[PDB]
Amino acid sequence: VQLQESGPGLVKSSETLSLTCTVSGGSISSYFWSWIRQPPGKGLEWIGYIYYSGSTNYNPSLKSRVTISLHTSKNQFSLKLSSVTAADTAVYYCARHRNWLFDYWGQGTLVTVSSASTKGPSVFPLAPSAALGCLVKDYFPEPVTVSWNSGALTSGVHTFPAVLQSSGLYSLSSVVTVPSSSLGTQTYTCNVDHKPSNTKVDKTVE
Amino acid sequence: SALTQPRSVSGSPGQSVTISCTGTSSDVGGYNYVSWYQQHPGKAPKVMIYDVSKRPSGVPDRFSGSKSGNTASLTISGLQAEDEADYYCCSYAGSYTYVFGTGTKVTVLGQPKANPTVTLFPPSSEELQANKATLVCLISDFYPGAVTVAWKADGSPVKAGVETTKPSKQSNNKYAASSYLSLTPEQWKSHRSYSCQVTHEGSTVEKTVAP
């Protein structure tokens, strides 16, 4: 049994999230068929399932917002989650459920919830008082790249993964650890490139 | 309420680890319908144990499961590289419902343990002029790749406005994580101090800032 989630990728805030799972290698006219998710944030969260008969049962905290339905003519089952917010951004997994366990899982699909349109970042300095950096705040969509001194500075650099904030906009940071006595003699510049908004920023830190 | 697992466990190749999974009499303690799932990055979770102690066909017998009262345990003997993954427990919770645990990363130790470097940056005056205030806690050069971050305002817990990233491998093979406390300039001004508290391998590193 193989399961494959399909879906919109991006959903606006307060819209309905709809996903489908197409099953191959066996029939959805046997057993239970379930959805589970994982916020980039937490572990797994069971959403609910549907028995092949059409009978459903949902996570008590999601029940009021959830519908799972069968589409047997295509060996598919679906999820509708109403009025999504930032807390619903997650990888959504479909899985077969049988004999008190979840025996076959899909690989999952990321749904991002954001009503944002394209926006380039504000880049703020993270000045030293030796570590220093750049806060690349409030951009959409991904991705941003960050270099330091146009590529010339690499040792002690790390650019962290983006967070998606409740605003529906992303932020990330990039930090560099440098020698204490370099602060007077040498400038440190983060080069932030956001292709989607056609924005490049060079910010020189303290 | 998600079932309670530890965040991180680790052991060397050939050695053993145990992962606990603590629920209640309504779930873990109420039935013998406890299963465990292994998840590699970007892969489908795989059932490793079901009904507390039973192994699916193909799963090596080095994986074993037990339960006492409200706590289930998964034990992985003779660790091999491929056992490095996230593991989740799951229980039947009554009235046709299920609850998953919070997840444990299992690390198979291939390099030296290391505690994080932690740097806490206050909001810049430039950001404050933009009418926003972001505290930025950057956490680098740790192994194994799992960390707990707690924010404090005047020493007491904060969990509004917190966003933390999952540890990422750096070019030097150690791990990095970031955390953000997002607030308004008046909220930033409404406390005497803020602290980012990072727990790793039973050790804490705390940095504090003030306006």
GROMACS .gro file of C-alpha atoms in nm:
model
  417
    1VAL     CA    1   0.000   0.000   0.000
    2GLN     CA    2   0.126   0.349  -0.112
    3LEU     CA    3  -0.039   0.677  -0.015
    4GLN     CA    4   0.016   1.018  -0.177
    5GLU     CA    5  -0.104   1.348  -0.041
    6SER     CA    6  -0.189   1.619  -0.295
    7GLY     CA    7  -0.274   1.980  -0.231
    8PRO     CA    8  -0.242   2.358  -0.269
    9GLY     CA    9   0.089   2.422  -0.086
   10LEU     CA   10  -0.020   2.776   0.015
   11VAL     CA   11  -0.358   2.854   0.177
   12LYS     CA   12  -0.473   3.202   0.278
   13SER     CA   13  -0.563   3.262   0.641
   14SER     CA   14  -0.932   3.203   0.719
   15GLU     CA   15  -0.981   2.988   0.401
   16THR     CA   16  -1.065   2.614   0.405
   17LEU     CA   17  -0.771   2.375   0.369
   18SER     CA   18  -0.850   2.086   0.129
   19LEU     CA   19  -0.612   1.793   0.078
   20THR     CA   20  -0.657   1.457  -0.099
   21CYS     CA   21  -0.484   1.127  -0.046
   22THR     CA   22  -0.471   0.885  -0.339
   23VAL     CA   23  -0.409   0.524  -0.234
   24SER     CA   24  -0.239   0.269  -0.457
   25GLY     CA   25  -0.174  -0.103  -0.402
   26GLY     CA   26  -0.501  -0.162  -0.213
   27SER     CA   27  -0.863  -0.046  -0.179
   28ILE     CA   28  -1.003   0.224   0.049
   29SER     CA   29  -1.311  -0.001   0.073
   30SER     CA   30  -1.129  -0.178   0.366
   31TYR     CA   31  -0.999  -0.052   0.702
   32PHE     CA   32  -0.967   0.311   0.832
   33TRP     CA   33  -0.811   0.608   0.654
   34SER     CA   34  -0.653   0.887   0.859
   35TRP     CA   35  -0.489   1.230   0.859
   36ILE     CA   36  -0.212   1.334   1.096
   37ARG     CA   37  -0.004   1.653   1.096
   38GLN     CA   38   0.315   1.795   1.230
   39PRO     CA   39   0.359   2.167   1.287
   40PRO     CA   40   0.718   2.278   1.234
   41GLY     CA   41   0.699   2.327   1.609
   42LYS     CA   42   0.575   2.002   1.766
   43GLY     CA   43   0.537   1.629   1.721
   44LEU     CA   44   0.264   1.441   1.544
   45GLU     CA   45  -0.099   1.534   1.590
   46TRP     CA   46  -0.382   1.297   1.494
   47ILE     CA   47  -0.658   1.481   1.309
   48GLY     CA   48  -0.903   1.199   1.259
   49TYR     CA   49  -1.009   0.913   1.044
   50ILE     CA   50  -1.285   0.767   0.831
   51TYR     CA   51  -1.386   0.400   0.829
   52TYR     CA   52  -1.453   0.251   0.481
   53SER     CA   53  -1.827   0.268   0.567
   54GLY     CA   54  -1.816   0.651   0.583
   55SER     CA   55  -1.822   0.659   0.965
   56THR     CA   56  -1.578   0.921   1.107
   57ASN     CA   57  -1.411   1.014   1.434
   58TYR     CA   58  -1.202   1.328   1.493
   59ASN     CA   59  -0.952   1.472   1.746
   60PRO     CA   60  -1.183   1.643   2.001
   61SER     CA   61  -0.991   1.974   1.969
   62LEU     CA   62  -1.021   1.979   1.585
   63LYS     CA   63  -1.364   1.817   1.546
   64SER     CA   64  -1.561   2.140   1.502
   65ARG     CA   65  -1.341   2.241   1.205
   66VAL     CA   66  -1.272   1.908   1.029
   67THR     CA   67  -1.438   1.691   0.764
   68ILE     CA   68  -1.285   1.372   0.621
   69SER     CA   69  -1.466   1.219   0.318
   70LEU     CA   70  -1.423   0.915   0.085
   71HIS     CA   71  -1.400   0.938  -0.294
   72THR     CA   72  -1.408   0.569  -0.378
   73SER     CA   73  -1.439   0.616  -0.756
   74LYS     CA   74  -1.078   0.743  -0.745
   75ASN     CA   75  -0.951   0.541  -0.444
   76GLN     CA   76  -0.907   0.873  -0.264
   77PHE     CA   77  -1.001   1.029   0.066
   78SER     CA   78  -0.986   1.394   0.160
   79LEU     CA   79  -0.946   1.641   0.445
   80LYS     CA   80  -1.125   1.975   0.483
   81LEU     CA   81  -1.002   2.195   0.766
   82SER     CA   82  -1.208   2.513   0.802
   83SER     CA   83  -1.087   2.867   0.864
   84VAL     CA   84  -0.718   2.798   0.894
   85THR     CA   85  -0.475   3.021   1.085
   86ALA     CA   86  -0.099   3.031   1.136
   87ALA     CA   87  -0.133   2.746   1.392
   88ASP     CA   88  -0.239   2.513   1.102
   89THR     CA   89   0.086   2.541   0.904
   90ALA     CA   90   0.219   2.180   0.911
   91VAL     CA   91   0.319   1.875   0.712
   92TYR     CA   92  -0.003   1.682   0.660
   93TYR     CA   93   0.024   1.303   0.642
   94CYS     CA   94  -0.233   1.052   0.527
   95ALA     CA   95  -0.209   0.699   0.661
   96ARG     CA   96  -0.392   0.367   0.662
   97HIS     CA   97  -0.520   0.270   1.006
   98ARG     CA   98  -0.581  -0.098   1.091
   99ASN     CA   99  -0.586  -0.307   1.409
  100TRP     CA  100  -0.510  -0.023   1.658
  101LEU     CA  101  -0.213   0.121   1.463
  102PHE     CA  102  -0.115   0.325   1.157
  103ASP     CA  103   0.052   0.069   0.927
  104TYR     CA  104   0.122   0.265   0.605
  105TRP     CA  105   0.195   0.636   0.586
  106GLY     CA  106   0.237   0.886   0.307
  107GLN     CA  107   0.558   1.092   0.297
  108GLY     CA  108   0.357   1.406   0.385
  109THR     CA  109   0.301   1.746   0.232
  110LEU     CA  110   0.372   2.090   0.376
  111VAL     CA  111   0.075   2.324   0.389
  112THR     CA  112   0.170   2.685   0.458
  113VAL     CA  113  -0.105   2.913   0.593
  114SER     CA  114  -0.047   3.280   0.509
  115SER     CA  115  -0.258   3.556   0.357
  116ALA     CA  116   0.061   3.755   0.274
  117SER     CA  117   0.160   3.882  -0.066
  118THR     CA  118   0.516   3.931  -0.171
  119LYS     CA  119   0.720   4.151   0.056
  120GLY     CA  120   1.092   4.210   0.081
  121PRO     CA  121   1.268   4.192   0.418
  122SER     CA  122   1.374   4.469   0.659
  123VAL     CA  123   1.726   4.386   0.762
  124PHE     CA  124   1.820   4.495   1.114
  125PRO     CA  125   2.171   4.486   1.266
  126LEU     CA  126   2.249   4.247   1.553
  127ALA     CA  127   2.540   4.456   1.686
  128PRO     CA  128   2.814   4.315   1.911
  129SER     CA  129   2.904   4.394   2.272
  130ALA     CA  130   3.264   3.868   1.955
  131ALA     CA  131   2.936   3.767   1.783
  132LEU     CA  132   2.729   3.982   1.544
  133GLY     CA  133   2.460   3.943   1.283
  134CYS     CA  134   2.160   4.040   1.074
  135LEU     CA  135   1.793   3.992   1.143
  136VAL     CA  136   1.610   3.944   0.811
  137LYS     CA  137   1.261   4.020   0.918
  138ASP     CA  138   0.912   4.005   0.763
  139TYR     CA  139   0.947   3.876   0.407
  140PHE     CA  140   0.729   3.656   0.184
  141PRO     CA  141   0.756   3.410   0.018
  142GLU     CA  142   1.069   3.204   0.094
  143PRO     CA  143   1.357   3.197   0.016
  144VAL     CA  144   1.622   3.444   0.134
  145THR     CA  145   1.998   3.388   0.095
  146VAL     CA  146   2.259   3.554   0.320
  147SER     CA  147   2.633   3.593   0.259
  148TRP     CA  148   2.883   3.794   0.461
  149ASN     CA  149   3.128   4.038   0.299
  150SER     CA  150   3.005   3.923  -0.045
  151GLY     CA  151   3.128   3.566   0.019
  152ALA     CA  152   3.470   3.661   0.162
  153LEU     CA  153   3.365   3.588   0.524
  154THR     CA  154   3.271   3.223   0.601
  155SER     CA  155   3.441   3.092   0.917
  156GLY     CA  156   3.207   3.116   1.214
  157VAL     CA  157   2.901   3.200   0.993
  158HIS     CA  158   2.567   3.034   1.032
  159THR     CA  159   2.246   3.139   0.868
  160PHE     CA  160   1.949   2.981   1.046
  161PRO     CA  161   1.625   2.838   0.896
  162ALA     CA  162   1.331   3.080   0.859
  163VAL     CA  163   1.045   3.098   1.110
  164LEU     CA  164   0.696   3.172   0.986
  165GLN     CA  165   0.545   3.423   1.226
  166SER     CA  166   0.176   3.461   1.307
  167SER     CA  167   0.175   3.762   1.074
  168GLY     CA  168   0.218   3.516   0.781
  169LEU     CA  169   0.561   3.662   0.713
  170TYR     CA  170   0.895   3.490   0.754
  171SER     CA  171   1.208   3.591   0.941
  172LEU     CA  172   1.553   3.445   0.971
  173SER     CA  173   1.887   3.554   1.109
  174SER     CA  174   2.250   3.504   1.024
  175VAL     CA  175   2.532   3.537   1.279
  176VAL     CA  176   2.909   3.555   1.254
  177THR     CA  177   3.165   3.508   1.532
  178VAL     CA  178   3.473   3.727   1.475
  179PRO     CA  179   3.794   3.819   1.666
  180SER     CA  180   3.728   4.086   1.935
  181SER     CA  181   4.007   4.317   1.809
  182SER     CA  182   3.877   4.319   1.446
  183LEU     CA  183   3.580   4.546   1.531
  184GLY     CA  184   3.774   4.872   1.478
  185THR     CA  185   3.990   4.754   1.187
  186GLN     CA  186   3.733   4.559   0.979
  187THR     CA  187   3.374   4.612   0.852
  188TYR     CA  188   3.118   4.329   0.855
  189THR     CA  189   2.836   4.333   0.596
  190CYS     CA  190   2.554   4.087   0.549
  191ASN     CA  191   2.429   4.057   0.188
  192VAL     CA  192   2.065   3.957   0.187
  193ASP     CA  193   1.908   3.845  -0.137
  194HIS     CA  194   1.529   3.798  -0.171
  195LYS     CA  195   1.471   3.698  -0.537
  196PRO     CA  196   1.086   3.694  -0.519
  197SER     CA  197   1.049   4.065  -0.430
  198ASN     CA  198   1.353   4.162  -0.645
  199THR     CA  199   1.523   4.290  -0.329
  200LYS     CA  200   1.889   4.277  -0.233
  201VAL     CA  201   2.009   4.443   0.087
  202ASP     CA  202   2.362   4.515   0.210
  203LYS     CA  203   2.366   4.593   0.583
  204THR     CA  204   2.697   4.683   0.754
  205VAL     CA  205   2.679   4.590   1.125
  206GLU     CA  206   2.805   4.846   1.391
  207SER     CA  207  -0.260   1.636   2.572
  208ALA     CA  208   0.024   1.480   2.371
  209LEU     CA  209   0.196   1.182   2.536
  210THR     CA  210   0.514   1.284   2.720
  211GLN     CA  211   0.845   1.162   2.574
  212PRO     CA  212   1.195   1.293   2.641
  213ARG     CA  213   1.334   1.533   2.379
  214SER     CA  214   1.666   1.362   2.317
  215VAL     CA  215   1.836   1.029   2.386
  216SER     CA  216   2.176   0.918   2.259
  217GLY     CA  217   2.418   0.626   2.267
  218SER     CA  218   2.721   0.492   2.080
  219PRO     CA  219   2.709   0.226   1.807
  220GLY     CA  220   2.653  -0.120   1.956
  221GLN     CA  221   2.493   0.029   2.269
  222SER     CA  222   2.141   0.065   2.400
  223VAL     CA  223   1.889   0.348   2.444
  224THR     CA  224   1.544   0.360   2.602
  225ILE     CA  225   1.265   0.610   2.521
  226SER     CA  226   0.981   0.659   2.772
  227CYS     CA  227   0.626   0.757   2.681
  228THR     CA  228   0.411   0.874   2.971
  229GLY     CA  229   0.031   0.906   2.937
  230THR     CA  230  -0.269   0.846   3.165
  231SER     CA  231  -0.517   0.573   3.259
  232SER     CA  232  -0.735   0.709   2.972
  233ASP     CA  233  -0.468   0.618   2.712
  234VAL     CA  234  -0.131   0.444   2.777
  235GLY     CA  235  -0.250   0.297   3.110
  236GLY     CA  236  -0.601   0.211   2.983
  237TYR     CA  237  -0.516  -0.027   2.696
  238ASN     CA  238  -0.240  -0.231   2.534
  239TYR     CA  239  -0.276  -0.037   2.209
  240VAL     CA  240   0.055   0.142   2.221
  241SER     CA  241   0.254   0.175   1.900
  242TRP     CA  242   0.585   0.340   1.810
  243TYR     CA  243   0.690   0.511   1.488
  244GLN     CA  244   1.034   0.588   1.344
  245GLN     CA  245   1.069   0.896   1.123
  246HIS     CA  246   1.370   0.989   0.908
  247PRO     CA  247   1.388   1.345   0.755
  248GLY     CA  248   1.137   1.384   0.468
  249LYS     CA  249   1.031   1.014   0.486
  250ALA     CA  250   0.706   0.842   0.576
  251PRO     CA  251   0.692   0.736   0.945
  252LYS     CA  252   0.733   0.359   0.986
  253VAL     CA  253   0.562   0.144   1.255
  254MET     CA  254   0.837  -0.024   1.464
  255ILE     CA  255   0.627  -0.163   1.751
  256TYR     CA  256   0.253  -0.218   1.802
  257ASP     CA  257   0.029  -0.346   2.081
  258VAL     CA  258   0.305  -0.251   2.331
  259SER     CA  259   0.562  -0.520   2.242
  260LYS     CA  260   0.494  -0.677   1.902
  261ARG     CA  261   0.718  -0.629   1.601
  262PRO     CA  262   0.600  -0.599   1.238
  263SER     CA  263   0.766  -0.834   0.986
  264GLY     CA  264   1.104  -0.692   0.876
  265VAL     CA  265   1.166  -0.491   1.196
  266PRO     CA  266   1.482  -0.621   1.374
  267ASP     CA  267   1.430  -0.782   1.717
  268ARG     CA  268   1.677  -0.530   1.870
  269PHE     CA  269   1.371  -0.302   1.882
  270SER     CA  270   1.155  -0.403   2.180
  271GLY     CA  271   0.864  -0.241   2.363
  272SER     CA  272   0.730  -0.261   2.719
  273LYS     CA  273   0.484  -0.084   2.947
  274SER     CA  274   0.442  -0.026   3.321
  275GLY     CA  275   0.132   0.161   3.442
  276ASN     CA  276   0.098   0.490   3.254
  277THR     CA  277   0.446   0.478   3.090
  278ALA     CA  278   0.543   0.285   2.777
  279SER     CA  279   0.905   0.231   2.679
  280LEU     CA  280   1.084   0.158   2.353
  281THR     CA  281   1.431   0.007   2.376
  282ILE     CA  282   1.679  -0.001   2.083
  283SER     CA  283   1.968  -0.243   2.154
  284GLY     CA  284   2.281  -0.266   1.935
  285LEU     CA  285   2.251   0.085   1.785
  286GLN     CA  286   2.342   0.128   1.418
  287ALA     CA  287   2.368   0.459   1.222
  288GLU     CA  288   2.029   0.401   1.056
  289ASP     CA  289   1.852   0.404   1.397
  290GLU     CA  290   1.924   0.779   1.410
  291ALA     CA  291   1.575   0.928   1.360
  292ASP     CA  292   1.279   1.076   1.546
  293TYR     CA  293   1.052   0.837   1.727
  294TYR     CA  294   0.690   0.888   1.832
  295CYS     CA  295   0.469   0.680   2.053
  296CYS     CA  296   0.098   0.662   2.001
  297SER     CA  297  -0.190   0.527   2.210
  298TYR     CA  298  -0.556   0.454   2.173
  299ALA     CA  299  -0.728   0.711   2.400
  300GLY     CA  300  -1.089   0.581   2.409
  301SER     CA  301  -1.402   0.660   2.210
  302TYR     CA  302  -1.230   0.593   1.873
  303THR     CA  303  -0.951   0.850   1.926
  304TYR     CA  304  -0.571   0.844   1.926
  305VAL     CA  305  -0.302   1.062   2.081
  306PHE     CA  306   0.066   1.082   1.972
  307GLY     CA  307   0.365   1.162   2.188
  308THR     CA  308   0.580   1.473   2.163
  309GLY     CA  309   0.870   1.297   1.987
  310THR     CA  310   1.226   1.196   2.081
  311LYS     CA  311   1.533   1.237   1.864
  312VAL     CA  312   1.764   0.934   1.890
  313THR     CA  313   2.127   1.024   1.810
  314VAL     CA  314   2.388   0.757   1.738
  315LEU     CA  315   2.698   0.921   1.868
  316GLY     CA  316   2.961   0.965   1.593
  317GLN     CA  317   3.142   1.278   1.720
  318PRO     CA  318   3.204   1.445   2.060
  319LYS     CA  319   2.926   1.587   2.275
  320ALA     CA  320   2.933   1.967   2.296
  321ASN     CA  321   2.730   2.231   2.476
  322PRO     CA  322   2.582   2.526   2.287
  323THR     CA  323   2.730   2.873   2.242
  324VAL     CA  324   2.437   3.107   2.319
  325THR     CA  325   2.415   3.472   2.214
  326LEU     CA  326   2.109   3.686   2.302
  327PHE     CA  327   2.061   4.008   2.105
  328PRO     CA  328   1.828   4.284   2.228
  329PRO     CA  329   1.603   4.459   1.974
  330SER     CA  330   1.803   4.717   1.771
  331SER     CA  331   1.712   5.086   1.810
  332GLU     CA  332   1.647   5.075   1.432
  333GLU     CA  333   1.383   4.802   1.480
  334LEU     CA  334   1.245   4.991   1.780
  335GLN     CA  335   1.209   5.297   1.554
  336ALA     CA  336   1.014   5.075   1.311
  337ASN     CA  337   0.777   5.018   1.607
  338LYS     CA  338   0.875   4.650   1.656
  339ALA     CA  339   1.092   4.461   1.904
  340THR     CA  340   1.251   4.120   1.838
  341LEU     CA  341   1.476   3.938   2.085
  342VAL     CA  342   1.704   3.698   1.899
  343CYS     CA  343   1.862   3.399   2.076
  344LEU     CA  344   2.118   3.224   1.862
  345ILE     CA  345   2.245   2.885   1.969
  346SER     CA  346   2.545   2.721   1.795
  347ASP     CA  347   2.805   2.448   1.807
  348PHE     CA  348   2.611   2.180   1.999
  349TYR     CA  349   2.585   1.802   1.969
  350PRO     CA  350   2.370   1.598   1.989
  351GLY     CA  351   2.127   1.805   1.778
  352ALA     CA  352   1.855   1.868   2.035
  353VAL     CA  353   1.800   2.160   2.273
  354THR     CA  354   1.526   2.304   2.497
  355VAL     CA  355   1.479   2.683   2.490
  356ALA     CA  356   1.280   2.866   2.759
  357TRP     CA  357   1.220   3.243   2.759
  358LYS     CA  358   1.182   3.444   3.078
  359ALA     CA  359   1.048   3.797   3.143
  360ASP     CA  360   1.159   3.927   3.486
  361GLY     CA  361   1.250   3.566   3.563
  362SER     CA  362   0.899   3.425   3.502
  363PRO     CA  363   0.800   3.206   3.199
  364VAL     CA  364   0.694   3.357   2.863
  365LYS     CA  365   0.500   3.161   2.605
  366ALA     CA  366   0.337   3.415   2.387
  367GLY     CA  367   0.533   3.545   2.088
  368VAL     CA  368   0.795   3.265   2.087
  369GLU     CA  369   0.920   3.097   1.766
  370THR     CA  370   1.209   2.848   1.771
  371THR     CA  371   1.377   2.660   1.482
  372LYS     CA  372   1.459   2.290   1.467
  373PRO     CA  373   1.837   2.230   1.501
  374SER     CA  374   2.023   2.247   1.166
  375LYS     CA  375   2.360   2.082   1.085
  376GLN     CA  376   2.642   2.336   1.033
  377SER     CA  377   2.943   2.299   0.800
  378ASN     CA  378   3.154   2.185   1.102
  379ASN     CA  379   2.901   1.898   1.168
  380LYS     CA  380   2.772   2.039   1.499
  381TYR     CA  381   2.417   2.184   1.530
  382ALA     CA  382   2.259   2.530   1.545
  383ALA     CA  383   1.915   2.657   1.654
  384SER     CA  384   1.748   3.000   1.681
  385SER     CA  385   1.469   3.136   1.897
  386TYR     CA  386   1.270   3.461   1.873
  387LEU     CA  387   1.060   3.652   2.125
  388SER     CA  388   0.847   3.891   1.916
  389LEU     CA  389   0.686   4.186   2.090
  390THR     CA  390   0.588   4.553   2.083
  391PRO     CA  391   0.831   4.833   2.201
  392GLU     CA  392   0.609   4.902   2.507
  393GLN     CA  393   0.597   4.525   2.591
  394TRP     CA  394   0.986   4.532   2.561
  395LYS     CA  395   0.985   4.827   2.796
  396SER     CA  396   0.728   4.660   3.035
  397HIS     CA  397   0.989   4.426   3.193
  398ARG     CA  398   1.326   4.497   3.368
  399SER     CA  399   1.496   4.194   3.203
  400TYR     CA  400   1.448   3.919   2.944
  401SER     CA  401   1.639   3.592   2.936
  402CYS     CA  402   1.685   3.307   2.688
  403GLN     CA  403   1.747   2.977   2.872
  404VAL     CA  404   1.899   2.694   2.674
  405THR     CA  405   1.908   2.342   2.812
  406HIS     CA  406   2.135   2.081   2.653
  407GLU     CA  407   2.258   1.743   2.793
  408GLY     CA  408   2.138   1.828   3.147
  409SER     CA  409   2.322   2.165   3.143
  410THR     CA  410   2.166   2.511   3.117
  411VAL     CA  411   2.309   2.822   2.950
  412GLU     CA  412   2.123   3.145   3.019
  413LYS     CA  413   2.174   3.488   2.865
  414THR     CA  414   1.996   3.800   2.980
  415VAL     CA  415   1.935   4.146   2.826
  416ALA     CA  416   1.776   4.470   2.957
  417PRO     CA  417   1.648   4.804   2.811
   0.00000   0.00000   0.00000
